[PDB]
Design an enzyme around this catalytic site. Structure first.
Site, short mmCIF file in Angstrom:
data_model
loop_
_atom_site.label_atom_id
_atom_site.label_comp_id
_atom_site.label_asym_id
_atom_site.label_seq_id
_atom_site.Cartn_x
_atom_site.Cartn_y
_atom_site.Cartn_z
N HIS A 43 0.81 -1.21 0.00
CA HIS A 43 0.00 0.00 0.00
C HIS A 43 0.84 1.26 0.00
O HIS A 43 0.27 2.35 -0.01
CB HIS A 43 -1.04 0.02 1.15
CG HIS A 43 -0.49 0.05 2.55
ND1 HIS A 43 0.11 1.16 3.10
CD2 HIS A 43 -0.59 -0.86 3.55
CE1 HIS A 43 0.42 0.91 4.36
NE2 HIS A 43 0.00 -0.30 4.66
N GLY A 64 2.86 5.77 9.30
CA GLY A 64 4.23 5.63 8.87
C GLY A 64 4.94 4.41 9.42
O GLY A 64 6.09 4.17 9.03
N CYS A 106 4.09 1.19 9.01
CA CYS A 106 3.97 -0.02 8.21
C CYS A 106 5.31 -0.40 7.61
O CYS A 106 6.16 0.44 7.33
CB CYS A 106 2.90 0.17 7.13
SG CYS A 106 1.25 0.17 7.86
C1 LIG Z 1 -6.30 2.63 10.56
C2 LIG Z 1 -6.95 2.90 9.20
C3 LIG Z 1 -8.44 3.21 9.43
C4 LIG Z 1 -6.28 4.12 8.57
C5 LIG Z 1 -6.82 1.67 8.28
N1 LIG Z 1 -7.51 0.52 8.85
C6 LIG Z 1 -8.55 -0.05 8.25
O1 LIG Z 1 -9.03 0.32 7.19
C7 LIG Z 1 -9.17 -1.24 8.97
F1 LIG Z 1 -8.27 -2.17 9.27
F2 LIG Z 1 -9.73 -0.88 10.11
F3 LIG Z 1 -10.11 -1.82 8.24
C8 LIG Z 1 -5.37 1.27 8.00
O2 LIG Z 1 -4.68 0.70 8.85
N2 LIG Z 1 -4.86 1.54 6.78
C9 LIG Z 1 -5.55 2.18 5.65
C10 LIG Z 1 -4.74 1.70 4.46
C11 LIG Z 1 -3.33 1.77 5.03
C12 LIG Z 1 -3.46 1.27 6.48
C13 LIG Z 1 -2.54 2.08 7.39
O3 LIG Z 1 -2.82 3.24 7.69
N3 LIG Z 1 -1.42 1.46 7.81
C14 LIG Z 1 -0.38 2.18 8.54
C15 LIG Z 1 0.98 1.87 7.96
N4 LIG Z 1 1.85 2.79 7.72
C16 LIG Z 1 -0.40 1.79 10.03
C17 LIG Z 1 -1.58 2.36 10.82
C18 LIG Z 1 -1.72 3.87 10.91
C19 LIG Z 1 -2.37 4.10 12.27
N5 LIG Z 1 -1.88 2.96 13.04
C20 LIG Z 1 -1.51 1.93 12.27
O4 LIG Z 1 -1.16 0.80 12.66
S1 LIG Z 1 -5.21 0.01 3.91
C21 LIG Z 1 -4.47 0.31 2.30
C22 LIG Z 1 -5.02 1.53 1.79
S2 LIG Z 1 -4.95 2.85 3.03
#
Ligand SMILES: CC(C)(C)[C@H](NC(=O)C(F)(F)F)C(=O)N1CC2(C[C@H]1C(=O)N[C@H](C#N)C[C@@H]1CCNC1=O)SCCS2
Ligand SMILES: CC(C)(C)[C@H](NC(=O)C(F)(F)F)C(=O)N1CC2(C[C@H]1C(=O)N[C@H](C#N)C[C@@H]1CCNC1=O)SCCS2
Lengths: 305, 305
Positions: free
Chosen positions: A41, A143, A145
């Site tokens: 992502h 940030g 991930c």
């Molecule tokens: C928590 C969210 C509501 C934003 C979202 N979650 C969901 O949609 C759920 F799981 F609830 F269905 C989610 O994690 N996302 C949305 C995407 C990226 C990913 C993400 O931000 N991953 C971060 C990294 N870097 C780490 C996150 C940030 C906060 N703390 C973490 O650990 S998924 C791919 C397209 S945008």
């Protein structure tokens, strides 16, 4: 003496951390030999978070579109491909700090250390468990991930987790290093929620054995129990069934303390039915389930790497 | 989201760990530039544990009597001296992995990470606090002495603790890197016991702010308090006095959450007087006091090293 939530030394993993940038999105990557592994992502746009078309997004990328940096050194990307939910960025330089490593897929109940990173730099290290519902109770911000979870055997780092998502109630979901999610989660912004979690019974017992080793013995009662009668009580309090494999895995701790596993089960049964009455065990007012039998032995016997 | 007992990445300290042996006694040493620092009780014998004559013991040693190993490499000792309760072994090779470092003496209430080591190899890393009674609640076995505690600022490792002793009830005592003990402890086997410990009030408040940041807000009440009236309640429950410096140190967290420090103090007062009634805060059934205000900001803002 003493018992702490203890993480693996992180040095071997620190030397593998890089940052990957696409447009304004920067995540962490893991650099092993001449491949950088990161969450796919990274190639997402603010437009198409709800259901990204990953294949189309990646087709539109050239190698030069991935800005990979190791410290203050740009690594030139010479190839790229997608494996399930991770990207593999081939770079022109093999990581000279690559440890001996393995990619493993852990089971629920097992534990690992997380090296939390931002922009390719480590923030801290902590110990987690793969919960029965395939989430982990981590600490992750925007940030984070691409941060990974791992165990160390001797000189070998077994990578088991890479971070992708935060789920409602602040728990976390991610993949193994082949990009396959733990649990029924997807890397898109859509209604997802973990199933009901449960307590990892074999781990609670291991932690009770650690308490006894440390001289915290007040909860030991005079009784015993059958495995079936124990599991009937465990079920009521949302504890996982204890299996014979679990009983055998507790063998070393049972042998060291001279307390039969089923005898410890009787004491745990009483704790579940009666509570702790304001007392603590190893400093905790709740029963702890994120130490495996192996974690307890490692910590209480001083195993090194 | 999420909040974990998080340690510093340990890689910079891992590259400094060696083992020191005299006779059959092996401990850890810390190798910086061309000096190895280790606890002086490495030169103790089974005979004279109750009150070792350290100066006589060291006089009878030559450089060759210290077997110092870094990994599988023997380091030749070319000089030795004693500074308070630590030995300084000059070796003929400067550690090529020496980080930027400082020796610091921390205050009670401050936190640091410990890299627990045996035979010069790391076992694990965990986060500790210097308790008000100058002990730490560590996890240490025979052979752990010479393990160190540290903070990292940016690229700089501040060493603050080296491990020497375990005290009754399984708490731990040690020195700064100039060999001066924290607290009224001595490195001999004699009747020693820590003074009564107290709860680090500014840290409990910082942790309550972390709870609010994570959306765990149930304990916030509608009241406020004066500093003096708060401290009268704190005293009754064996909490340290909250000072104006503490209030100002909580400024960033108070500003981020919009909760005045004295308003949080009113909620903490109610928790102390009424208990938590079976509820948890950030997953804990007890109030946590081993996160500083700076630890909370670091973890909740993603500061890296
Ligand atoms: C928590 C969210 C509501 C934003 C979202 N979650 C969901 O949609 C759920 F799981 F609830 F269905 C989610 O994690 N996302 C949305 C995407 C990226 C990913 C993400 O931000 N991953 C971060 C990294 N870097 C780490 C996150 C940030 C906060 N703390 C973490 O650990 S998924 C791919 C397209 S945008
Ligand atoms: C706990 C003891 C009862 C053995 C003792 N303690 C005390 O005498 C008290 F403090 F209670 F007064 C103590 O720690 N000693 C005795 C000496 C060494 C040192 C020691 O074994 N230090 C270990 C290192 N390596 C780490 C210890 C081992 C267990 N877990 C730890 O952390 S003092 C110098 C001469 S022998």
């Amino acid at each position: 003496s003493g018992f702490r939530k203890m993480a693996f030394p992180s040095g071997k993993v620190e030397g593998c951390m890089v940052q990957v940038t696409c447009g304004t999105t920067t995540l962490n990557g893991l650099w092993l030999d001449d491949v950088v592994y990161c969450p796919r992502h990274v190639i997402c746009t603010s437009e198409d978070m709800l259901n990204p078309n990953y294949e189309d997004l990646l087709i539109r990328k050239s190698n030069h579109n991935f800005l990979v940096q190791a410290g203050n050194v740009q690594l030139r990307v010479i190839g790229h491909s997608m494996q399930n939910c991770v990207l593999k960025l081939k770079v022109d330089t093999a990581n000279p700090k690559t440890p001996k490593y393995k990619f493993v897929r852990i089971q629920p109940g097992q534990t690992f250390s997380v090296l939390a990173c931002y922009n390719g730099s480590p923030s801290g290290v902590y110990q987690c468990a793969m919960r029965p519902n395939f989430t982990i109770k981590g600490s992750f911000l925007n940030g984070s991930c691409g941060s990974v979870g791992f165990n160390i055997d001797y000189d070998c780092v077994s990578f088991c987790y890479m971070h992708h998502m935060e789920l409602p109630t602040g728990v976390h979901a991610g993949t193994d290093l082949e990009g396959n999610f733990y649990g029924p989660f997807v890397d898109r912004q859509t209604a997802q929620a973990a199933g009901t979690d449960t307590t990892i019974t074999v781990n609670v017992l291991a932690w009770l054995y650690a308490a006894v080793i440390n001289g915290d013995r007040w909860f030991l009662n005079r009784f015993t129990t059958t495995l079936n009668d124990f599991n009937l009580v465990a079920m009521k309090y949302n504890y996982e069934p204890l299996t014979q494999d679990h009983v055998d895995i507790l063998g070393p701790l049972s042998a060291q303390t001279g307390i039969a596993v089923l005898d410890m089960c009787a004491s745990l049964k009483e704790l579940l039915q009666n509570g702790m009455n304001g007392r603590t065990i190893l400093g905790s007012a709740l029963l702890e389930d994120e130490f495996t039998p192996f974690d307890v032995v490692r910590q209480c016997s001083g195993v090194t790497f």
